[PDB]
């Protein structure tokens with residue numbers, strides 16, 4: 616009982632400590648006396664709002680279907696026995712003492728750690744993309760790490776089934792993912808329904824790991840683009856030709872010419888294979904951008920690369936879930952159903 620508020624985790628979990636505050640409730644560590652290991656437990660109270668319900672359901676569905684060393688698992692779910700009584704859900708996960716965002720705030724990464732973390736990020740992303748899922752909010756704070764540097768991808772709140780045929784949109788379309796890790800096509804002509812938008816975000820994370828600072832810290836949506844172009848240089852005519860939308864193409868054509876700033880001038884201490892890989896992930900044209908499996912096969916990752924130990928999903932989401940269409944009541948109801956596998960005998 617209680618830790619500020621009610622935090623009622625049944626017989627199995629003992630001695631709580633407040634960790635922090637999530638989007639839907641509080642988070643504590645607790646002791647799991649079936650595994651005799653300390654765990655993380657997130658209290659989620661989403662059922663008032665159709666949008667909270669939608670993101671909860673989506674995340675629960677994905678994380679239960681995923682099974683991978685580099686993606687956070689759900690170990691258990693605690694909730695009331697009936698829909699009427701269910702006001703909260705508790706999600707139990709492996710305890711991950713830190714995240715890449717906290718770590719980069721104060722710690723220098725060795726080349727060996729940059730390389731290791733990048734490998735793990737790509738190995739988990741390979742699994743995700745093989746399930747036809749796009750993460751769509753990759754950033755240092757969504758990469759959890761435990762005291763031995765196991766890295767796990769988390770927060771699938773914004774994730775979607777890939778839909779490369781319906782990716783096109785107009786100029787300056789409303790986007791929800793964290794600004795600094797957004798690929799340039801999101802501002803221009805993309806809904807972010809192609810895998811290449813995740814590779815762009817991993818590129819930004821690499822750049823950040825190389826220098827301890829965000830590489831593209833735009834303050835707003837066209838500033839994000841002026842940041843990208845000030846480094847990559849003006850897009851070539853060939854790359855412009857791929858942007859059919861007139862307003863987006865005319866915007867780029869109105870900007871002053873900018874030359875590329877070479878990577879090794881920005882990152883003079885970086886391994887030169889890291890920079891070669893970085894260049895390939897931060898390429899303006901999303902069809903020329905490197906894919907996950909090619910990145911895993913790049914010379915920079917040669918000490919880790921082993922395709923037989925880089926699993927793909929057995930069970931792809933054909934979907935999408937069709938989650939926009941549903942009232943709060945059907946969603947709470949689907950969450951109940953989705954969490955039933957954790958109830959003592961069923």
Ligand SMILES: Nc1ncnc2c1ncn2[C@@H]1O[C@H](COP(=O)(O)OP(=O)(O)O)[C@@H](O)[C@H]1O
Pocket residue numbers: 634635636637638639642655657708709710711712713759770
């Ligand atoms: N598996 C975990 N292990 C340890 N601490 C965690 C875990 N998940 C979340 N936390 C901590 O609790 C806080 C709230 O997390 P979260 O619900 O993801 O909210 P937000 O994404 O807004 O930070 C996080 O900032 C994190 O530091």
